[PDB]
Write a protein that binds this ligand. Sequence first.
Ligand SMILES: *[C@@H]1O[C@H](CO[C@@H]2O[C@@H](C)[C@@H](O)[C@@H](O)[C@@H]2O)[C@@H](O)[C@H](O)[C@H]1NC(C)=O
Length: 129
Amino acid sequence: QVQLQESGGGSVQAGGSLRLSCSGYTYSSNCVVWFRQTPGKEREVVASIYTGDNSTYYADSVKGRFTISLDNGKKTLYLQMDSLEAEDTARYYCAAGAATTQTMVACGRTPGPYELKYWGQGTQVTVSS
Ligand SMILES: *[C@@H]1O[C@H](CO[C@@H]2O[C@@H](C)[C@@H](O)[C@@H](O)[C@@H]2O)[C@@H](O)[C@H](O)[C@H]1NC(C)=O
């Protein structure tokens, strides 16, 4: 069995950049998603990638401001955050596996359902300004 692990958080001045790293996914083909937990607010999908065809879904707010990348062996997924804004301040979560078929179709394409079998605790980002 496996549990996802995250790293790369902290406090950074606006206009800065910072790399978020998720590790643990054994899947050659499955869905990996990064959420954001704005404190005392709702969960928001940041981005998703389907390892099978490397299809990428990027949330419109972070569009062109964030990048999602996978190391060789597809053993680690990085979310490189650029041009950080105070709104992005939150705790960021990584998760993978797709329980619902209709999450599976939407991964890398639409916001969709995005329901996920395995989750990790994640790390906190504070955008100083
Ligand atoms: C999927 O991509 C694999 C390599 O990842 C690519 O390069 C890294 C540096 C990241 O930028 C990542 O986002 C890129 O997709 C390939 O080894 C693999 O063959 C690709 N598979 C398919 C089906 O395209």
